[PDB]
């Protein structure tokens, strides 16, 4: 009985190097361990017999659906397109921007303009919209 | 108590280049862009152009681009719009309007001023 | 920009009546199934006041009085029971793209 407790034992002290090793030193991009809500800071105390982890998570509230387009692009210029970063083109619907398209985050709707800080260049594609007057990056 | 007290009227000789203003009160200036309208006729009017109040982005309607710039007195909660080199065929009535969304994604212009005039 | 007309020119209705007026654009305003279609009211002395928006009826400032209707290119107002405080010219108002240009309008007169 003893020997097969102490070698479970072992083989979960493994997973625990592992958490700590990506949970503790460093933010998770992985989902799956810690509470599910992306990952932030985690913590370690010491308990009985083992290690006790805290893992603070994000848990979204209150979705709401909005339009969104794919990418945009300048009508005039083919050439001319761009796709969000780390977030969606959306429709507007704050009455401080004047565009057609506003930007947001991924994880948290707040509208903002579209600029070069957040947004890529890229090759065209069919389901971009075709933009006729007012973007910024590329002015042209 | 939302107000938009434009500037009074006035008889403005042809060349000058006309400002006019337009001052939020009741609520918060900065967050609502300012359209702008000209009504030569009781059927007929036209949108000039929009102001952010709080990033200051612009646009004109194209015949006015290279005439009519707009800017802000963010302190004085005031907007105004200056149009260059004014002619008989700007006799008008002006307005400015606050942007609002009752709809989603629909532009209104919820409340107006009380209308000044230039000839 | 998209040609936005109306009719007929003026009505005249008794009061208690029901009326309408007739909107046509030169192309479809449809994007995305929001239409943009706002309807207007002006009287002199007046600046222009918002009735209407495409989905409220009620709301944007009036009672359910105003009904807009109709998609794609042809849009209407009905008002099924005018007084002689309705008299007023009115417009169509189209919010789907630059530089925002609307109708002429028409007038609503009391028999």
């Known amino acids: 009985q003893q020997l097969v407790r102490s070698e479970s034992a072992a083989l979960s002290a493994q997973l625990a190097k592992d958490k700590v090793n990506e949970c503790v030193k460093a933010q998770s991009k992985r989902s799956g361990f810690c509470g599910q809500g992306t990952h932030i800071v985690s913590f370690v105390v010491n308990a009985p017999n083992g290690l006790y982890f805290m893992h603070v998570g994000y848990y979204p509230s209150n979705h709401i659906e909005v339009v969104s387009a794919y990418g945009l692009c300048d009508a005039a210029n083919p050439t001319n397109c761009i796709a969000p970063v780390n977030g969606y083109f959306i429709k507007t619907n704050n009455t401080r921007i004047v565009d057609e398209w506003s930007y947001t985050g991924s994880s948290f709707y707040a509208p903002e303009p579209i600029t070069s800080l957040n947004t890529k260049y890229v090759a065209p594609q069919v389901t971009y919209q075709n933009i006729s007057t007012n973007l910024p990056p590329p002015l042209l | 108590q939302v107000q938009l007290q434009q500037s009074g009227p006035e008889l403005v000789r042809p060349g000058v280049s006309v400002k006019i203003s337009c001052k939020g009160s009741?609520?918060?200036?900065?967050?609502?862009?300012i359209h702008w309208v000209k009504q030569s006729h009781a059927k007929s009017l036209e949108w000039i152009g929009v102001?952010?109040?709080?990033?200051?982005?612009?646009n004109y309607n194209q015949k006015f681009k290279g005439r009519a710039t707009m800017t802000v007195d963010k302190s004085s909660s005031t907007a105004y719009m200056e149009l260059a080199r004014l002619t008989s065929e700007d006799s008008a009535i002006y307005y400015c309007?606050?942007?609002?969304?009752?709809?989603?994604?629909?532009?209104?212009?919820?409340?107006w001023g009380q209308g000044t005039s230039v000839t | 920009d998209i040609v936005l007309t109306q009719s007929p020119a003026s009505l005249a209705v008794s009061l208690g009546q029901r009326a309408t007026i007739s909107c046509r654009a030169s192309?479809?305003?449809?994007?995305?199934?929001?239409?943009?279609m706002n309807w207007f009211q002006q009287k002199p002395g007046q600046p222009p006041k918002l009735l209407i928006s495409?989905?409220?009826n009620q709301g944007s400032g009036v009672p359910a009085r105003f009904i807009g209707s109709g998609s794609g290119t042809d849009f209407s107002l009905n008002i099924h029971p005018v007084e002689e405080d309705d008299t007023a010219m009115y417009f169509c108002?189209?919010?789907?793209?630059?530089?925002?240009?609307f109708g002429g309008g028409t007038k609503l007169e009391i028999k």
């Open positions: 309007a606050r942007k609002s969304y009752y709809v989603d994604y629909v532009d209104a212009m919820d409340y």
């Open positions: 009741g609520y918060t200036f900065t967050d609502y862009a």
């Open positions: 102001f952010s109040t709080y990033y200051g982005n612009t």
């Open positions: 192309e479809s305003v449809d994007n995305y199934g929001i239409s943009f």
């Open positions: 495409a989905t409220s």
């Open positions: 108002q189209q919010s789907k793209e630059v530089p925002r240009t």
